């Protein structure tokens, strides 16, 4: 039940960065579900890279590669 750790304040602040002036009370649980789907679709790839390398430790390059194949290239943690 760690998903409760994405608190409502942590959501509101991200909505503020996105420009949202007024927030409906039903948005949060949908947002959590959306994040859970995104996390699963990234971690499954990361763990597939970890396993092909036979490593037991996940490396940040794996997360970069999971994003890059999925199109959302990240600069800063590698190159």
């Amino acid at each position: 039940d760690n998903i409760q750790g994405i608190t409502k304040p942590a959501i509101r602040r991200l909505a503020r960065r996105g420009g949202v002036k007024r927030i409906s009370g039903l948005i949060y649980e949908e947002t959590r579900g959306v994040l859970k789907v995104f996390l699963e679709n990234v971690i499954r790839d990361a763990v597939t890279y970890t396993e092909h390398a036979k490593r037991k430790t996940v490396t940040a390059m794996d997360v970069v590669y999971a994003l890059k194949r999925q199109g959302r290239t990240l600069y800063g943690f590698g190159g």
């Binding site: 942590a10 002036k21 996940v58």
Partner: protein, 96 residues
């Protein structure tokens, strides 16, 4: 003394677009990633950077979705974003 609605939300918007720290807490996310990952493989281990790279991607994705949601909200001539605005945006973007 009391400020009226929206005036401080405006101060929040201007602040958090000016500021640039990460806004999700580290420890809860760190556990959430382990909980999700162990269903694919037990007894995994994580480099301390991989969690930060995940948190960066998750915050950026959500911020972009809230941008598109807010445009969908002004098109219906509301100012409140609605769950159906998220669903519509996700459908037009083509992920739903």
């Amino acid at each position: 003394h009391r400020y009226r609605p929206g005036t401080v939300a405006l101060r929040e918007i201007r602040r958090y677009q000016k500021s640039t720290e990460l806004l999700i807490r580290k420890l809860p996310f760190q556990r959430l990633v382990r909980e999700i990952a162990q269903d694919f493989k037990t007894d995994l281990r994580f480099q301390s950077s991989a969690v930060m790279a995940l948190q960066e991607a998750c915050e950026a994705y959500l911020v972009g979705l809230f941008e598109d949601t807010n445009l969908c909200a002004i098109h219906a001539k509301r100012v409140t974003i609605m769950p159906k605005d998220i669903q519509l945006a996700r459908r037009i973007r083509g992920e739903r």
